[PDB]
């Protein structure tokens, strides 16, 4: 449901997570993490992270936020049309990752938080206002993907 003009708002502050994408996804993740504590519960892998400073030396989380945003990123260029993207992720995130609807709302104010800290001066209200409807899409899709597995969207 974006206009062509919000799509190109979309992709134009998305232009600044790819100049350092996993810069981006760490900060996502521990916002994430730091925000909603639960959902370190989801990451075997990062259940001995016990502060932020150990989130940040962690080498797999940062590996794991770029991993993430590189991902989410193949989703927005196609905006919209991302179906063949975002039906593997909506499989693996209901079957092996137990991911919630609600946490891809608690991960979507997130990659909005971060963006709006590093980069105010491009992240306007017509930039927000679009990235806002961006993700939603995202995760409308995701849940409809999710409910037509047989699963709760
Ligand atoms: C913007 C939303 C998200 C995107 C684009 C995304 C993307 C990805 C990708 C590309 C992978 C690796 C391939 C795969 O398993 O499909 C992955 C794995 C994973 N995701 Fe997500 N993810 C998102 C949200 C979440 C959230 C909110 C959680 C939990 C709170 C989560 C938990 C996991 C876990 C536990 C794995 C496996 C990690 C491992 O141990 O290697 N994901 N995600």
Request: no cysteine.
């Amino acid at each position: 449901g974006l206009s062509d003009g919000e799509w190109q708002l979309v992709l134009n502050v998305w232009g600044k997570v790819e100049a350092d994408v996993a810069g981006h996804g760490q900060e996502v993740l521990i916002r994430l993490f730091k925000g909603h504590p639960e959902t370190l519960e989801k990451f075997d892998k990062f259940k001995h992270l016990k502060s932020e400073d150990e989130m940040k030396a962690s080498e797999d989380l940062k590996k794991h936020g770029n991993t993430n945003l590189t991902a989410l990123g193949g989703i927005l260029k196609k905006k919209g049309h991302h179906e063949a993207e975002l039906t593997p992720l909506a499989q693996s995130h209901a079957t092996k990752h137990k991911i919630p609807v609600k946490y891809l709302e608690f991960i979507s104010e997130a990659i909005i938080q971060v963006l709006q800290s590093k980069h105010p001066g491009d992240f306007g209200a017509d930039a927000q206002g679009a990235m806002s409807k961006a993700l939603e899409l995202f995760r409308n899709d995701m849940a409809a993907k999710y409910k037509e597995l047989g699963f709760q969207g």
